[PDB]
């Protein structure tokens, strides 16, 4: 009965809802899950994501100017993989932080 309570939660936490959680879901980022019956219980097929080719890239924190309307960026400025020339809607506008020219 206790593990059945765990089963109810598992279906709601992983199958019916999305991920955005770090504990009750499939290894790595959780993309989707499936259920099928099994002898005496349920059977779960959490489908995940996996990085597998990490590359170390230096990145500035933020972007200021002469004035200070900072935009919260791989180093001229790149907005899991690939590079993008323009933030457009990607960068928000928070308040400034230290070590100027960048939020740093």
């Amino acid at each position: 009965a206790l593990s059945a309570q765990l089963a109810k939660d598992k279906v709601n936490e992983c199958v019916k809802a999305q991920s955005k959680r770090s504990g009750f879901c499939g290894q790595g980022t959780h993309i989707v899950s499936f259920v099928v019956n099994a002898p005496n219980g349920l059977y779960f097929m959490h489908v995940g994501y996996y990085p597998s080719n990490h590359i170390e890239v230096v990145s500035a924190y933020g972007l200021c100017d002469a004035a200070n309307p900072t935009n919260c960026y791989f180093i001229t400025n790149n907005t899991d993989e690939w590079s993008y020339t323009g933030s457009s809607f990607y960068a928000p506008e928070p308040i400034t932080s230290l070590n100027t020219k960048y939020v740093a």
């Binding site: 999305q18 099928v36 099994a38 097929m45």
Partner: protein
């Protein structure tokens, strides 16, 4: 029991959205995955919409699941252990303690 689970499978794409809880929205499974993927992960739309066919890695994962349902798949072993558990007491404990 299969009816329950197949309704669940149907409900997947609709229920899994910003919508919230039950408010299912009849949506294609493809779009469901690309939203789950642009949302849970930081892969940008350009990585997903411009080049798709990530479907191929998805299907490789599903196939490896289908091909190997042997005991060495650790999860399948637990199902066998649960069956062995209740058979153990029902089939053996009773028979040996009445002979």
């Amino acid at each position: 029991e299969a009816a329950y689970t197949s309704s669940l499978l149907g409900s997947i794409a609709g229920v899994g959205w910003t919508a919230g809880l039950s408010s299912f929205a009849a949506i294609p499974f493809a779009q469901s995955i690309f939203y789950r993927l642009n949302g849970v992960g930081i892969t940008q739309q350009v990585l997903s919409e411009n080049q798709k066919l990530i479907a191929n890695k998805f299907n490789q994962a599903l196939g490896a699941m289908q091909t190997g349902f042997t005991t060495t798949n650790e999860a399948f072993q637990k199902v066998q252990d649960a069956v062995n558990n209740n058979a153990q007491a029902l089939s053996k404990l009773a028979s040996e303690l009445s002979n």
